[PDB]
From a paper:
Escherichia coli bacteriophage T7, a member of Podoviridae, has been used as a model for understanding the DNA packaging mechanism common to tailed phages and related dsDNA viruses. The phages package genomic dsDNA into a round procapsid using the portal in complex with an ATP-dependent terminase complex as the motor. At the beginning of phage infection, the tail is responsible for receptor recognition, and the portal and tail act as a tunnel for DNA delivery into the host cytoplasm. Here, we determined structures of the DNA packaging intermediate and mature capsids of T7 using cryo-electron microscopy (cryo-EM) and symmetry-mismatch reconstruction.
The DNA-free T7 capsid II particles, which were considered to be a DNA packaging intermediate subsequent to the T7 procapsid and morphogenetic precursor of the mature phage, were purified from cells for cryo-EM structural analysis. The local refinement and reconstruction improved the structural resolution of the portal to 4.9 Å. The lower resolution of the portal structure in the capsid II suggests that the portal might be flexible to some extent or deviate from 12-fold symmetry during the DNA packaging. The portal in the capsid II is formed by 12 copies of symmetrically arranged protein gp8 with similar topology but different conformation compared with the portal in the mature phage (discussed below). The absence of the barrel in our capsid II portal structure and in the phage procapsid portal structures suggests that the barrel is not involved in the DNA packaging. The portal clip region interacts with the rim of the open icosahedral vertex and five protrusions around the inner capsid surface. A structural comparison between the portal in the capsid II and that in the mature phage revealed that the portal undergoes considerable conformational changes from the packaging intermediate to the mature state. The whole portal moves downward, resulting in the exposure of the clip. This movement causes a squeeze between the inner capsid shell and the wing. Therefore, the wing undergoes a rigid-body rotation by approximately 25°.
Author numbering:
A (entry chain c), B (entry chain b): 12 to 46, 51 to 148, 155 to 184, 212 to 362, 365 to 428, 434 to 492
Write the structure that this text describes.
C-alpha cells in the first residue's frame, strides 16, 4: 500500500543475502563486497573460473543472438479458420517484422553485454533490470532491492536503492495495472504513477531456484559447496608447501667467531672461518599432506566441472567430436532443470516487457492483436535424436527390399512406433506413386 | 469430519519428516531448514550434485515438453463400432485439440519450472500442489501439510499451513464429491465448500516410495546413505590434511635473544642472530588416512553415480555412444521401479485434474464423454529392441534366398517367434504379390 520504506523490506531479506555473501566469497568476488581495504582474493581459481565459464554458456543458450524469439499466432479456431484464406503470409509479414525489429533492437540496443554482466551474477541468487523510451539497461543487486509475495511467486511491492532514491512499484487496490512513484526521504518527486498493466511496464526480478517459494529466491552455486573442499585444500597445501622451503633463517650464537657478515660473502665452494658449526638453520620438520590432498583436489576438479558445463576435452578426447558432442548433450540437460526456471524469469519476461513497451506505437506497428503470445524456442533435442534412429535402421532394411515373404511397409511402421515419429509425412500413399513412374 | 486442527495431524507425521531432515542434511539443504544464523554446508559435493542431476532427468522423462500425454478413446465395443463409420477422424479433432490446448497450456502456464522446483524435492519424500481458474502452481512442503489414509493409499482429510491459514479438504459422509473450506483460528473464512468430485478438484499429494503404505510416504535418497560414507570421509580427510600443514605456530622461549620480530624480517637466505635454536615449530606428527580413504571415496563415487543416473561418460568412453546409449538404457530402468510410482502421483493426477478443471466449459470444449481416460505414454523400450533383432537376423537370411532345400518364409516365422513380434503386418500374403510384378 502506502508507507513507504525499504528498511522494513531489507529486514525481511537478510538471510538470503548473507548466504550470498558467502557464495560470493569463494568464487569470484566481486559480485559482492564483503558486508582502507587492500585486496583479498580467491586462491581457489578453479571454483572461480567455472562461474565465468558458465556465463558464456548461459548467455548463449538463453539467447543465441540469431533468431531466438518466435512470435506465434497462436491459433484461435476462427483465426486459424480465417486465415484461411492464406493471409497467414501477411501475418508473417506483421510478425517477422516485429521479429525483424526486436532482433535489430536488442543487439542494437546493447542489452546483451549488459545482460551478461547481470546474468552471470544470477548464477548467484538474483536480481532486477530494464528501462524504456541510447536506452541501456540497469542492473540492481542484492545490496539494493527488496521484493515480495505470499503467493505462487508474483510481485507485490518492489523497493529500490541506488544513491538516496527509493521506488515503490506497488500493486494497488481497486486496481488492475500497477502504479509506481519514486521518492526521496519524504515524500514524492512528482515522477508519478503509471498504473502498469500487469507484468508489462516494467521490470521483473528473476527468481533462479524457486525453493520453497515466497521470497527473492535463494540460488545457486549454494548447491555446490564441494568447492569449499577445494578452496580450503588448495590453501592448506600452499602455505604449508611455501613457508618451510623459503623462510630458512640462519641461527647464530652471538658468542663469537661465527659472524653473520662473513658467512654471506664466501662463494659456494669457499671455506669460511667459523666456530665448529655454531650457527645452524631451523628448517622445519617433516610435513605430510601430499598424497591425500593432491588426489582429492584433482578428484574435486573432475566432480566440480560437470557442474559448470565445460567441454572438458581432457586422452583428450580424440575420437572425438561425436564423442565430444555426446558428452555435451547428456551434460547439457543436467542444467535442463534450470532452463525452465531461467526461461520464466527471462524469455517470457524479456520479450513480454519490451513488446508491451513497443505498444507505444513507435514502429511496433500493430497494437498487438491478442493474443500474439510469443515463446522463446529452446531442448528438442530429442526430436533430432528420435528421428535419426529410423535412418540407422531403415538403412538396415534396404537389403531386404526384394524378398517376398514380408511386407516392408508394415515392418517400417513397426520400427516407426519404436521411435515416436509416427505418421504425417513419413508414409507414402498409393495414389502418389505413378506421377513419378 | 469436523474438528478442525492440523496439530493432531502433525503429531501423526513426525517420524516421516525427521528422516527427512536428515536426508536433507547431507545433500543440498535447503530443501529443509534444520528444525543470528550464519551458514553451514554440505562438504560432500558429490552427494549434493547427484540430486540436482536427477532432477533434470526426472523432469524430462516424466514429461518431455513435446507430446507426453495421449488422450485415448478408449474403445467401448459400440464406440469402436460407431465410429465406424470413420468419425474417428473427428474424435481426433476433438482430442488433439484438447491435446493441442494442454500442450499450449502447461508450457504456457509455466508449471514446468515450478514443477521442477517441487519435483526435485520429491526425490526427498513428498509434497502437494496446484490451483485453478497468470495461474501458477504452489509447492507445499513437509513442514507444511498433513494427510491420511487407512486404506490402500487414498485421501481422507488434508490439512495445510502457510502463513495462519488452514485448509480442510475432508472426505464427507452422505457424500461423494469432496468438500473443502479454509479457516483462520476459528472458524471459517466463508470461502466455502466445493464437493470436489473425487480426485478432480483438487490437489493430490505425491507418495514416492509406498512402503508399507498408510502414510505421507517416506522416500527416498534414504535408500542411499552410502553417501554418509562419502561425506564423512571427505570431511575426515580434509580437516586432517588442512590443519597440520597450514597452522605452523612458532614456539619461542621468551628467555632472551631469540626475539619474534627479528625472525620475520630476514629473507630466506638471511642469517639471524639467535640463541642456538631455542625457538622451534610444533608441526604435527605423522598422520595417515591416505590410501584407504582415497580409494574408498573414488569407489563410493562410482557406486553412488549409477544411482543418480549420471551419463557417466567417464576411457572416456570413446566407444561410444552406441556403448553410451546402451549404458543409459540398462541404467535407466534401474529407476524403472520409480517410474510407475512417479506416474501414479503424477501423469494420471496431473492430466486428470486439469482436464477435470477444464470441465469449466472454457474451451475444453466437450463436456468429456466418459470415458476419455488418458494415459501418459512412457519404457517400450523393449519393442524397439525386440524389433531390431529381426533385421540383424533377417539380414542374415538374405544370402540363402536362392537355395531350394528349405522354405525361407517358414524359417523367418521361426525367428519371428524368437523375438516376440509375431504377425499382423510382418507376413506377406500370396494375393498381394502380382499387383507389383
Amino acid at each position: 500500500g502506502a508507507k513507504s520504506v525499504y528498511e522494513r523490506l531489507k529486514n525481511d531479506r537478510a538471510p538470503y543475502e548473507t548466504r550470498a555473501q558467502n557464495c560470493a566469497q569463494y568464487t569470484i568476488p566481486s559480485l559482492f563486497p564483503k558486508d582502507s581495504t587492500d585486496y583479498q582474493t580467491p586462491w581457489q581459481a578453479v571454483g572461480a573460473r567455472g562461474l565465468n565459464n558458465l556465463a558464456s554458456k548461459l548467455m548463449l543458450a538463453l539467447f543465441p543472438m540469431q533468431t531466438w524469439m518466435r512470435l506465434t499466432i497462436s491459433e484461435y479456431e476462427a483465426k486459424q479458420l480465417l486465415s484461411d484464406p492464406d493471409g497467414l503470409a501477411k501475418v508473417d509479414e506483421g510478425l517477422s517484422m516485429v521479429e525483424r525489429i526486436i532482433m535489430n533492437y536488442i543487439e542494437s540496443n546493447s542489452y546483451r553485454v549488459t545482460l551478461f554482466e547481470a546474468l552471470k551474477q544470477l548464477v548467484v541468487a538474483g536480481n532486477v533490470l530494464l528501462y524504456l523510451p541510447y536506452n541501456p539497461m540497469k542492473l540492481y543487486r542484492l545490496s539494493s532491492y527488496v521484493v515480495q509475495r505470499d503467493a505462487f511467486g508474483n510481485v507485490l511491492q518492489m523497493v529500490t536503492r541506488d544513491q538516496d532514491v527509493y521506488t515503490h512499484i506497488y500493486l494497488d487496490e481497486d486496481s488492475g495495472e500497477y502504479l509506481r512513484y519514486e521518492e526521496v526521504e519524504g515524500m514524492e518527486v512528482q515522477g508519478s504513477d503509471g498504473t502498469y498493466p500487469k507484468e508489462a511496464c516494467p521490470y521483473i526480478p528473476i527468481r533462479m531456484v524457486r525453493l520453497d517459494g515466497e521470497s527473492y529466491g535463494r540460488s545457486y552455486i549454494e548447491e555446490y559447496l564441494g568447492d569449499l573442499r577445494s578452496l580450503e585444500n588448495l590453501q592448506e597445501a600452499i602455505v604449508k608447501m611455501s613457508m618451510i622451503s623459503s623462510k630458512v633463517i640462519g641461527l647464530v650464537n652471538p658468542a663469537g667467531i661465527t659472524q653473520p657478515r662473513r658467512l654471506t660473502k664466501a662463494q659456494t665452494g669457499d671455506f669460511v672461518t667459523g666456530r665448529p658449526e655454531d650457527i645452524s638453520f631451523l628448517q622445519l620438520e617433516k610435513q605430510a599432506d601430499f598424497t591425500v590432498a593432491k588426489a582429492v583436489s584433482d578428484a574435486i576438479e573432475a566432480r566440480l566441472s560437470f557442474a559448470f558445463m565445460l567441454n572438458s576435452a581432457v586422452t583428450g578426447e580424440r575420437v572425438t567430436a561425436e564423442e565430444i558432442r555426446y558428452v555435451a548433450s547428456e551434460l547439457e540437460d543436467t542444467l535442463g532443470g534450470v532452463y525452465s526456471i531461467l526461461s520464466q524469469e527471462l524469455q517470457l519476461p524479456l520479450v513480454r516487457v519490451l513488446l508491451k513497451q513497443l505498444q507505444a506505437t513507435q514502429q511496433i506497428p500493430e497494437l498487438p492483436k491478442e493474443a500474439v503470445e510469443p515463446t522463446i524456442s529452446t531442448g528438442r533435442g530429442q526430436d533430432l535424436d528420435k528421428l535419426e534412429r529410423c535412418v540407422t535402421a531403415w538403412a538396415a532394411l534396404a537389403p531386404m527390399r526384394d524378398d517376398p515373404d514380408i511386407n516392408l511397409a508394415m515392418i517400417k511402421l513397426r520400427i516407426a512406433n519404436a521411435i515416436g515419429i509416427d505418421t504425417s509425412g513419413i508414409l507414402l500413399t498409393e495414389e502418389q506413386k505413378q506421377q513419378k513412374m
